[PDB]
Amino acid sequence: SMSYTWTGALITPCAAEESKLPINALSNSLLRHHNMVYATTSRSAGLRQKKVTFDRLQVLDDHYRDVLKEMKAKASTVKAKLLSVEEACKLTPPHSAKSKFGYGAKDVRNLSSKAVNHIHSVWKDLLEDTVTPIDTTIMAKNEVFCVQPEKGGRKPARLIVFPDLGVRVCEKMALYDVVSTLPQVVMGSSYGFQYSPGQRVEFLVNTWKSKKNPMGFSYDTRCFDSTVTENDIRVEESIYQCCDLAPEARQAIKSLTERLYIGGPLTNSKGQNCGYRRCRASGVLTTSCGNTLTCYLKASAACRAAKLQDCTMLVNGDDLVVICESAGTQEDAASLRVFTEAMTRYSAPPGDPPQPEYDLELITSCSSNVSVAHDASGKRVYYLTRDPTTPLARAAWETARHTPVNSWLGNIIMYAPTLWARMILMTHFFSILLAQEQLEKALDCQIYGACYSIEPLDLPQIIERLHGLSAFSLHSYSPGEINRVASCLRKLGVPPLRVWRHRARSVRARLLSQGGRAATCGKYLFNWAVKTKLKLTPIPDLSGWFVAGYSGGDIYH
Numbered sequence: 001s002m003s004y005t006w007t008g009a010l011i012t013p014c015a016a017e018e019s020k021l022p023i024n025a026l027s028n029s030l031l032r033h034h035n036m037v038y039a040t041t042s043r044s045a046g047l048r049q050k051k052v053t054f055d056r057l058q059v060l061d062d063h064y065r066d067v068l069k070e071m072k073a074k075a076s077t078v079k080a081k082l083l084s085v086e087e088a089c090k091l092t093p094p095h096s097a098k099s100k101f102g103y104g105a106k107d108v109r110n111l112s113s114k115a116v117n118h119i120h121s122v123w124k125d126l127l128e129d130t131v132t133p134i135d136t137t138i139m140a141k142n143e144v145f146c147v148q149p150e151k152g153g154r155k156p157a158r159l160i161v162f163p164d165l166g167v168r169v170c171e172k173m174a175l176y177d178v179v180s181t182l183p184q185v186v187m188g189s190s191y192g193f194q195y196s197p198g199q200r201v202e203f204l205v206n207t208w209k210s211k212k213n214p215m216g217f218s219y220d221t222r223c224f225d226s227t228v229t230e231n232d233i234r235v236e237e238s239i240y241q242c243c244d245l246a247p248e249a250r251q252a253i254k255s256l257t258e259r260l261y262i263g264g265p266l267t268n269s270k271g272q273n274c275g276y277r278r279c280r281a282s283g284v285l286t287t288s289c290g291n292t293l294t295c296y297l298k299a300s301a302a303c304r305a306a307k308l309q310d311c312t313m314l315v316n317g318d319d320l321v322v323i324c325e326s327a328g329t330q331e332d333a334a335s336l337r338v339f340t341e342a343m344t345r346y347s348a349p350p351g352d353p354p355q356p357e358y359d360l361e362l363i364t365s366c367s368s369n370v371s372v373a374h375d376a377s378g379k380r381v382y383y384l385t386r387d388p389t390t391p392l393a394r395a396a397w398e399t400a401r402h403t404p405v406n407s408w409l410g411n412i413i414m415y416a417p418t419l420w421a422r423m424i425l426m427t428h429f430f431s432i433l434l435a436q437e438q439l440e441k442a443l444d445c446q447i448y449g450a451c452y453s454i455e456p457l458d459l460p461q462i463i464e465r466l467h468g469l470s471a472f473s474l475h476s477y478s479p480g481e482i483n484r485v486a487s488c489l490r491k492l493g494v495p496p497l498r499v500w501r502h503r504a505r506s507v508r509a510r511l512l513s514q515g516g517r518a519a520t521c522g523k524y525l526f527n528w529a530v531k532t533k534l535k536l537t538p539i540p541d542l543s544g545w546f547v548a549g550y551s552g553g554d555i556y557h
């Protein structure tokens with residue numbers, strides 16, 4: 001069936017949308033090529049609609065079924081709990097979109113009687129009705145990128161489809177525990193979201209080593225959400241249903257599946273019917289877990305069809321990477337063809353054809369790749385990095401405009417060991433925080449789809465716990481990484497690293513003069529900017545981070 005059916009009504013914005021990079025007095029210090037940065041708007045919704053609207057056909061064989069039976073077997077060992085209303089409420093983001101029934105995220109977090117009462121009615125309705133399609137709002141996402149000449153210029157906005165706040169709280173009650181625990185049990189070490197960036201690197205490295213003659217490839221399916229069929233979504237539900245669940249949760253999960261996850265009508269911000277959906281909704285609690293399960297199932301079955309030996313996979317939603325025993329350059333390239341053919345049969349055709357790789361560092365998954373640097377003792381060490389183009393473009397935007405999500409902070413946290421994050425991101429933003437005296441001001445960022453509220457003064461401890469003390473001492477990066485960064489800076493008109501090192505000394509001195517937690521930031525985050533280093537000793541914090549992905553899941557911590 002068709003992924004979507006449209007009425008003709010436009011995807012409308014809910015507020016004024018900016019497309020050009022906002023500019024203030026701080027802009028030029030970071031980036032000069034302003035015309036290269038842009039944000040997507042509803043204005044390009046039509047283009048996206050065309051890319052994501054197509055017919056899906058599925059041909060399921062024994063390998064698919066065999067894999068599924070195995071997945072259900074592990075799933076049946078899972079026991080999930082129903083979340084109370086108060087519990088679900090506290091998982092709601094302070095700035096989550098308000099309900100159309102008279103209450104917002106604040107009312108939900110405070111457990112207002114109005115909010116709580118409506119939630120109870122929605123829940124009761126889920127239990128009493130398993131057939132009425134639930135409404136959803138389709139919106140065009142506003143995201144910042146750098147123009148990509150060798151791609152088509154600018155990317156059209158991505159679409160987000162989500163149900164009302166009341167329904168969103170109900171999803172949490174019925175499936176938060178499920179989507180938080182099931183994946184790791186079913187997929188084991190292949191479930192990507194259970195790792196911090198350092199553990200991810202470690203798992204890729206040990207997996208690569210575990211093979212006599214390693215070979216790996218990333219597999220990117222075209223518009224994964226749109227390739228997800230009704231069958232896929234019902235298979236996802238049969239898996240959830242394998243868990244030891246409370247009778248009330250089974251009914252709720254069956255209801256949400258039939259009424260929301262399988263598909264439903266699309267309404268714009270103006271309240272007009274835009275059409276109907278028959279594929280994965282990007283804005284529901286099961287988006288990450290569902291995509292991950294479906295991707296793991298199709299790829300695992302595809303590996304058997306292609307006869308790839310000793311296949312170890314790493315899955316993060318729709319992002320797939322596979323490492324296995326090479327049977328030879330020629331044999332490997334042939335297998336990939338079969339793999340891709342099977343994936344296609346399963347309704348997961350490729351965007352960019354997959355290609356075998358024999359150098360772990362040349363594989364990009366989740367927009368990242370492993371690279372090498374050296375620690376204090378001079379030891380060779382691996383860490384996760386990525387092309388800094390998008391992170392820098394977003395930093396530029398956030399430099400002049402406050403946003404709901406601070407990507408620079410999320411990036412410093414996730415890529416703390418990187419050359420670009422340490423020299424540019426940290427230097428630039430701490431300078432800004434210093435000038436405004438907002439070092440102690442908590443900021444919202446996003447990690448694995450979940451929203452976290454974090455004080456930059458806490459960066460030192462956060463980084464140490466996540467990446468180890470070594471993150472404050474890496475040096476001698478690879479020529480490849482150095483050149484990618486230096487090249488990206490010229491592309492965007494960003495001052496060269498030598499300028500950043502000079503600025504860091506100042507920011508460092510400034511942080512030190514303020515003593516306390518600020519000084520710790522200066523001492524640890526910027527020890528790389530001094531000629532003669534300090535010792536750097538552990539720093540004298542709850543982390544329920546890195547357990548599951550919640551992209552588009554409306555989750556807060």
Ligand SMILES: Cc1cc(S(=O)(=O)N2CCC[C@H]2C(=O)O)c(N)cc1Cl
Binds near residue numbers: 365410411446447450
């Ligand atoms: C290193 C890394 C970082 C992120 S993240 O920084 O948590 N991510 C990318 C930017 C937005 C954010 C998210 O997924 O919420 C993700 N998803 C995957 C990997 Cl392998």
